[PDB]
Design a binder for these strands. Structure first.
Lengths: 109, 356, 60
RNA sequence: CGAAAGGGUCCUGUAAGCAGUAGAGUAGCCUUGUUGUUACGAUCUGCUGAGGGUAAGCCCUCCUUCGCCUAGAUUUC
RNA sequence: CGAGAUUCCCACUGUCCCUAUCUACUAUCUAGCGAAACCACAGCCAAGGGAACGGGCUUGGCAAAAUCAGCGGGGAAAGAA
RNA sequence: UGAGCCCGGGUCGAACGGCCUCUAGUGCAGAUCUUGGUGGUAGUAGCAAAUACUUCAAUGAGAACUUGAAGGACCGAAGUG
RNA sequence: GAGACCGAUAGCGCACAAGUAGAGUGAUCGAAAGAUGAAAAGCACUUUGAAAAGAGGGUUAAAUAGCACGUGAAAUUGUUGA
């Protein structure tokens, strides 16, 4: 309901990247993460953390992990006459194992 | 290839049409000709064969059988045709009252945004003393028509499919006077009709379907090579086919809970394979088990109809004693009929201790 | 801003290649304002331009 | 409806780590060892049909968790 | 591991095919950019049209906007001792 | 009859015509004619190989090929020095 | 000093920053290209646009003369009308 809200998600990059060219898996993973955030928060303005880019390209151009655990935070873009009022920022989060984890909302307090 | 399946074109309709019902005479009893179902998959069986004259006589043979999910169909209409020098002409059709949301979905194309206003005036025609007009239509069918068909639709919401739009078709009524057929259909209004009511076991039928497409394919696979007579490149697959003489081996009741059990295998199990039919799911309804391969992919709409001609073979007069039905996984090299058998064979496990 | 000239001049003043000099991303405005081989020494003393160490070449 | 998760079904073939004197072997202590000790250690065995993958064109979900939704543009006798 | 016992295959060729490696050419749509060859006018058939001549004529088959893709046919040939 | 001649309407701005003779670099559909301009083809053929790019931020009206930082690749002293 | 000559595809190759630009190792070869308006009076100012420019406005007898400029054909093209 709230326009400003942050949640934690698990992305099955295995099913997103099945059959894709090895030499294009990682950029395809970045585009699939952008599409995932766009579908989840309904915002076309998605900004990725450079350390999330690190995590995607951790194992080379064709070693993208099967499941990635991310935090997507929808915030307000003030700017000056911006085309989109809200924007989603996606970060990589540090967990022991990105399996068996449900979708959880993270509280700012 | 054969110049008998040309103009090698994609099927104009996904449902597939009968194109010929068996000829009708009044002396036979009143009955329906065709039915509908959805291809769930196929499995392996063993039949104690009684083919006098065969080398497999009084022996066990392994056969492949196709399984068709057949939820009961609902009668929602009655159409009457007349004979004219130009062919058959649909003189008039009278529907049922209280049509279902699935058949109304069949009528609509964007059902979600629509005001769902189909057949409301027709229901008012029933309720508001225009039943005189409706009876007039029934009597017109009685006194002018020569062949009568019944409008029936399937139950997707029982079929384990993502679809919600049903399938209508006309099943021809045979064996009686036009008055008897009209009364039969009118009484069949708003009632489910079952596949064991239309067909039964041991009976060869004809299957109408649309065979699977493969897109733009060259002559090597389109015809089988090393003017219309010359092999050309184009669409291969997605073709309307009527495949004849397929033996109905079993009709399972869905609520039996022992559909796959035979008088030889005393295992209380159902037709659905261990883990479910691949890409289809579970069969929880009446199902038809027929010999051999059948046109169409899994979850495709299928038309089952009676044979046009009385049979000329001893394969159509034979009883089918089943020995067992395979319920192993189709998702790989499965060797267990039931999860209980798998557990008994493999013992207990670490997750079993952790959960218990 | 374009910092090709700053990159080259910082390499010249630090006595290294263009690949071993690091410009502060947070101070690109001041690095751009600096356009002389004395202002770049000012920045190097201030810490905004750094000579990165050689790549590790473990021999064991 | 979508994303996760759980269970089922398939594929591979027994994870990391720790421990047992089982351990072929590599060396120190003090003096003779008839059963001397202390450390390292291939390989073995146990925890372990475990560990990993599982629809991307597999199967199921009783409130398993989260989210979405009566839109906005054109055209029609 | 055992005097351990028993079974199978070892060829040449100036021959052919397939698999393997290397070399070369191999490519649909979208945004942008962007030629040339060639061009009387045209392009649906069958028979007939004396001069082994038909594409326009006779008389028949017929024949319904605008397109996409594939392509294996036609729109190319003699001159005669 | 014809080659042609005359008038009206519109545009335009500085010279031109009838009649009788004289004179000639005097009349075009062709010359694979000359010069120039313009089409169909056609938004078609096509815009190669050197494995490879990605995230954030900055300037700018506008950023795949402009820059800074971070990654992922490469030349490998007979170098892409 | 003249002409029954030619009049910018004509007349010398050159009416113009023409033996120039350009081509060839070199000997050499060698073009295309004139015209606003009487007078620049060659559009002040306002507005949109990043800008180029556009729209108002203005000069002029004329902008149906805006330095892509006298008149402005055909081939070819766009829009509207049938």
């Amino acid at each position: 309901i709230a326009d400003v809200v942050a949640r934690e998600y698990t992305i099955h990059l295995h099913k997103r990247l099945h059959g894709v060219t090895f030499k294009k898996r990682a950029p395809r993973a970045i585009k699939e993460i952008k599409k995932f955030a766009q579908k989840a928060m309904g915002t076309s303005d998605v900004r990725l953390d450079p350390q999330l880019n690190k995590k995607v390209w951790e194992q080379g151009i064709k070693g993208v992990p099967f499941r990635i655990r991310v935090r997507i935070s929808r915030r307000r873009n003030d700017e000056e006459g911006a085309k989109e009022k809200l924007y989603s920022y996606v970060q990589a989060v540090n967990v022991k194992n990105p399996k068996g984890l449900l979708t959880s909302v993270v509280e700012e307090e | 290839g054969s110049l008998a399946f040309l103009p090698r074109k994609r099927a104009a309709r996904h449902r597939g049409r009968v194109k010929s019902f068996p000829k009708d005479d009044p002396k036979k009893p009143v009955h329906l000709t065709a039915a509908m179902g959805y291809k769930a998959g196929m499995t392996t069986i063993v039949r104690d064969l009684d083919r006098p004259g065969a080398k497999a006589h009084k022996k066990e043979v392994v056969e492949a059988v196709t399984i068709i999910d057949c939820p009961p169909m609902v009668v929602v209409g009655l159409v009457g045709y007349i004979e004219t020098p130009r062919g058959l002409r649909s003189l008039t059709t009278v529907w049922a009252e209280h049509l279902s949301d699935e058949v109304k979905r069949r009528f609509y194309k964007n059902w979600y945004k629509s005001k769902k206003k189909a057949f409301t005036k027709y229901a008012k025609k029933y309720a508001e003393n225009n039943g005189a007009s409706i009876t007039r239509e029934l009597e017109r069918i009685k006194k002018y028509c020569t062949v009568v068909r019944v409008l029936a639709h399937t139950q997707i919401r029982k079929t384990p499919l993502k679809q919600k739009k049903a399938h209508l078709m006309e099943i021809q009524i045979n064996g009686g006077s036009v008055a008897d057929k009209v009364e039969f259909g009118r009484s069949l209004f708003e009632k489910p009709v079952t596949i064991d009511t239309i067909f039964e076991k041991d009976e060869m039928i004809d299957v109408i379907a649309v065979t699977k497409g493969h897109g733009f394919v060259g002559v090597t696979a389109r015809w089988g090579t090393k003017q219309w007579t010359v092999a050309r490149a184009g669409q291969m697959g997605y073709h309307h086919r009527t495949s004849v003489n397929h033996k109905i081996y079993r009709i399972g009741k869905g609520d039996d809970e022992a559909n796959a059990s035979t008088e030889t295998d005393l295992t209380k199990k159902k037709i659905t394979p261990m883990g479910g039919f691949v890409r289809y799911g579970e069969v929880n309804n009446d199902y038809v088990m027929i010999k051999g391969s059948v046109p169409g992919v899994k979850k495709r709409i299928m038309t089952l109809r009676k044979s046009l001609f009385t049979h000329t073979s001893r394969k159509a007069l034979e009883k089918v004693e089943l020995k067992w039905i395979d319920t192993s996984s189709e998702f790989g090299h499965g060797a267990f009929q039931t999860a209980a058998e798998k557990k008994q064979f493999m013992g207990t496990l670490k997750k079993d201790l952790q959960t218990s | 801003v374009n910092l090709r000239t700053q990159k080259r001049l910082a390499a010249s003043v630090l006595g290294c290649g263009e690949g071993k000099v690091w410009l502060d991303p947070n101070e690109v405005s001041e690095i751009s304002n600096a356009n002389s081989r004395q202002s770049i020494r000012k920045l190097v003393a201030d810490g905004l331009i750094i000579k990165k160490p050689v790549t590790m070449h473990s021999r064991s």
